[PDB]
Amino acid sequence: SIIDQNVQALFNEISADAVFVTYDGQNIKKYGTHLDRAKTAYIPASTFKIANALIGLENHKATSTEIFKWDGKPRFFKAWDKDFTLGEAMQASTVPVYQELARRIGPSLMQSELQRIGYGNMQIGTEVDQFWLKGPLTITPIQEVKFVYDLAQGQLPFKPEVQQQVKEMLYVERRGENRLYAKSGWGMAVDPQVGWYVGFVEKADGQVVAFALNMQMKAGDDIALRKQLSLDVLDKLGVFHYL
């Protein structure tokens, strides 16, 4: 199919090894320069914020209204120097706010909850606020698409309210009545570095196509590429067309 060929042509100048997995509730479809990446486990990085938010709200450790106050000490980026709700922090990818959520959840509950939902290898180690940034928690792009697909359909083992709230924290944009929900991740603290753009497209008629861009990153790469590349792929597949 020429559609599949058009998609592979996007990965021509992408020197980095990469895979784009799609899931529609039935079929898994793999695109990119290195398809084995789809069944290979990598640290989740900021994509873990989806599970971290679900676990926190489910176990009454935070609300989607609750404001995480900035004490005034300058953070790693200027953009994080303000107060945040979990939804604001999801879009801004405010690591410290979600590190505080993880500290409130604690090692025991986080450990049992990841085992209960079956998230990746389910291993957290001793550092409760560093396991998604440095390991030992890893997850495959195939596991990522299935997890966000269930989130989109409300089928994850969490309360309907909890999933709906976290779902709208991922909302990026709409085109007609086609809605894009997504989360970026750049695992900088490991070799080889991993780049994520995970999410789903919810069509007007109720259909869902969950996706996962997974590629190798290196210091100095363009931060905007993961999203841009994911939007180009989604356009070439006819899943989320440009206006």
From Swiss-Prot:
Outcome after substituting residue 132 to A: Reduces catalytic activity about 5-fold with respect to nitrocefin. Reduces thermal stability
Function: Class D beta-lactamase which confers resistance to the beta-lactam antibiotics, including penicillins and oxacillin, and moderate resistance to carbapenems such as imipenem; in the DH10B strain of E.coli. Acts via hydrolysis of the beta-lactam ring. Has benzylpenicillin-, oxacillin-, cephalothin- and imipenem-hydrolyzing activities.
Membrane topology: Lipid-anchor
Family from the record: Belongs to the class-D beta-lactamase family.
Sorted UniProt keywords: Antibiotic resistance, Cell membrane, Hydrolase, Lipoprotein, Membrane, Palmitate, Plasmid, Signal
Coiled coil: none
Cellular component aspect of the GO annotation: plasma membrane
Effect of residue 77 to I: Reduces catalytic efficiency about 300-fold with respect to oxacillin, and about 30-fold with respect to penicillins and imipenem
Species of the source: Acinetobacter baumannii
Lineage: superkingdom: Bacteria
GO biological process annotation, one example: antibiotic catabolic process
NCBIfam families: bla_class_D_main, blaOXA-58_like
Modified sites of kind N6-carboxylysine: 49
Name of one Pfam family that matches: Transpeptidase
Name under which the protein is recorded: Beta-lactamase OXA-58
